[PDB]
């Protein structure tokens, strides 16, 4: 059995990623919450509410509510006030744990030493804080699956940077320098694989509780993604990362490269600068991340349709 | 009649660009020399020698031999010691002018006010110095055709930056902020259109003086480009820029965008950061450059074969 | 009764500062250890050994052994391999606690809420980590006494920066932005008040255990300070800070100003940039630190002689 | 005979510096104008008008009207709209030369090779541009006398930077790296030597044309300097620099040190960072400037009273 922590700035694609793991009988041992997409206290409530819909009592540990050093902005314009459109949900029964996410990560890394996997689909503040307190988690965590970066400089939050890295580039720099086994899925790869109008219409006609929930959660994000980002539909940054974590054959091209995080407050803040070892100069010959450059869209969407037929 | 200055850090593709203009009856009013690809004094001699092969006495004005502020490196590993392989040519009769290129640019902008075009296929130091001395050249020069940048961060001199901009990013920043009418051809566009083994073999069998010269001038560059940069053949960064300046239909996709030059001494030195007006934040809504994103390869190579049949 | 944590990159002046507090019946509730002056594991042993000489069993909590983000250098050339010259001491009985200093700071801030004082005579990594995990410590800690900075740009570790801030300028920036009640004693103030040859000779003739220990601990530092830094004797950066914490009248000039920490990796790394509200432009009108600009040397040395007569 | 160019962002202390040279029979071969203190076209008119009051026809060459790269602000709040209070003077007869100051500097460096001295009491843009066009001026100019910097980080335009360097720190970096023989007079040295109320009253009672002109030109600057900068009277940054150029014994302490110019757009823009070779690390052991740290106030004021008795 595989054991995962999922780290969430909880909006629509975080909820769907949690569900992809659970639907597929992956052991989710904790959900950790970090600043990012929407108001932090609503992110905590979103996760608790999400667990209730699937009858689970997995602990939710609130973590950092701001970056280590930098200021950031939430993006409720992108995801809705509640992260799933403008509805702001509230759990009926479940309550957040008191312990800080960074301390929970250390405890869980000990309990599941050598087998724990970390699904880093959000800003990296909690993982950085856990590392800073206990450097031994680099061996104890088997694998870090990172949704982050823009490896061709086609960013979302700025023209050249991706949101998760940009929110806390100091935390990202710490994580990328620590020695974790990282596989990274960039924004400017996943935008090549949007959910098309044809696919969206198929989902709207499924009429299961899950398909209805997906339509409800994604409508606002789809409108924004199409109108502002000029994406032909909506993207699945976190759900693609999660699908590859579950089934690695969904990734069809990977390269091990050396990634530098820009942690300045300059215009280049949050950029992922990638040495491919093919230029006239080089920064390092030691790769620190396996980067996914292509996926099998058909295989990915098969996992999504399977999830939406759950109930 | 069109009137051009060509600004050269003279290596193989600068020589071929000069010849493309001359073969095609474009009036080249001066050649200006700038630091870059190889030793500066050999760059001056290369240009004088090149003019001799085609019976012209166009003036050659030596300009800047170092960037405004930064240190740089020459790349004789890429182009050969002489910029056309390891041969180091010497003109028999022609001599360089005494006047600094920046002063010649100002004089020529006055003589050809409203019609002068500037083919900026090299680091931008001379054009920047001319602007700094006389800001009025922004109207007097009709068009600046720039070979420069990496708009997907796929660089040559560093992993993320292109050579011409990286050599003198202060000069580039001055040029991009001045208000010139700029059309820019990036490195990470032109590398999609290498001269293939099939095309190279056709050229090797042509047996004209020009085809023999092309083979001689490009052999070293082709070996390096294939082995280090992993290009399938060799690229034509300057000759593509020149071909588009002559015949704009060679460019098949263009976008007007806002380009920021990174002029730090940090790892991101020399990057061209491009706002496409499609992100959650934006730096400016005022474009400053028309960027070429695609070309017609067949049309471009037709111009090259035509040139090689000259004599 | 006043209650203090003392945070040490333990070398000679940290030992003397601990003793100044204890000699004078200030309640020291913990010693916390941070990276800085010498090898981290020897810093832990130095503190344990120091407590043994005065019959105390105060807990010692090892904290960060490296900066949050940056690389740093130890300075055993300045303080000796063991921080008190080249002797490397070892406690006979006392052992370090297991709990991380940052977690101990949070616990102690709760136990002594509203009365706890923090003597920050070292790099600020532990206090920053404690804040990041629990922001409420800003009210619970009554006062932070900081030895740090160079307010006229007369640095020690670099020409323009002071060691404690330079080692971890990210941690410093976090601390200075958090909202603590800070009084700061700069390097380029304390160097105006060295222990003179006259004073040193008086100490060498005292013949108490404490005076003999002081001579032993300071000989290497005095030689280095005089030969390299060109100080006329040796300075007491931490002991002056501590003396002012005990008796505020030792400070004879203070100003509340706005301090910005340079946390770049550029040449200005670690600078404390001070807005005095007297320039043609201003960064903020909100002070964040009370800075000590002058002391009464006679009063300070009276505290030192008193300490050396303890036993 | 000594031969000088004086480079002016012409306000009150530039006018007085020109007069100090002329009163004392130093050959002023040209006045060059640069962006800085007030509107550029008024700076040109100020210089022409100033020459008329002393019956000279020395050529005035307009130079740069903006920094090489950065934006800047004028400071008419400090000097008055006209740079000498709010009066905006106009020459009756003299006209500016057409030739750019940078080209005039090169011509004059050739005409007076080995003897020309450059009084750089303003932003360094013209000298940088002249160097960039002809690097040989570094030997041909005997001496550069620079009013600039803040060597204890006590700035005027920002809390930590001095105006002349801050306006164009790229130009400053070029000048300080070129190899000129530089003696530098910092802002945070000259502010120790203001014109006191006693001295001001003596001047107000002199009743010569020059004393009346001095009172008229300095009233606005004195009010501002006292109220904002908290100076006890008004300072003479340029006139002190000029006095030392004329009589070196006015400087009573000098040190040869290594000065780095901060040419970023960060908060530290325009800082002069000085390596004294006394820190635990060092940037270079090669000095590039002789810095004046103290003057004889009595000797300086004797030169001023002598000037005011001219007519
Ligand atoms: Na997320
Ligand atoms: Na070129
Ligand atoms: Na310390
Ligand atoms: Na001036």
Coordinates of N, CA, C and O and ligand atoms in Angstrom, one line a residue, chain D residues 7-9 14 37 121-122 238, ligand 4:
Chain D
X7 N 31.8 70.2 -14.7 CA 30.5 69.5 -15.1 C 29.4 69.8 -14.1 O 29.6 69.4 -12.9
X8 N 28.4 70.4 -14.5 CA 27.3 71.1 -13.7 C 25.9 70.6 -14.0 O 25.4 70.7 -15.2
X9 N 25.2 70.2 -13.0 CA 23.7 70.2 -13.0 C 23.2 71.5 -12.3 O 22.8 71.5 -11.1
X14 N 27.1 74.9 -7.7 CA 27.9 74.8 -9.0 C 28.3 76.2 -9.5 O 29.5 76.4 -9.9
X37 N 19.9 68.3 -10.5 CA 19.2 69.1 -9.5 C 17.9 69.7 -10.0 O 16.9 69.7 -9.2
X121 N 31.2 67.5 -10.2 CA 30.4 67.9 -9.0 C 28.9 67.6 -9.3 O 28.1 68.2 -8.6
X122 N 28.6 66.7 -10.2 CA 27.3 66.4 -10.7 C 27.1 64.9 -11.0 O 28.2 64.2 -11.0
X238 N 29.8 71.0 -3.2 CA 30.6 71.3 -4.4 C 31.8 72.3 -4.2 O 32.9 72.1 -4.7
Ligands
LIG4 NA1 26.6 69.7 -9.5

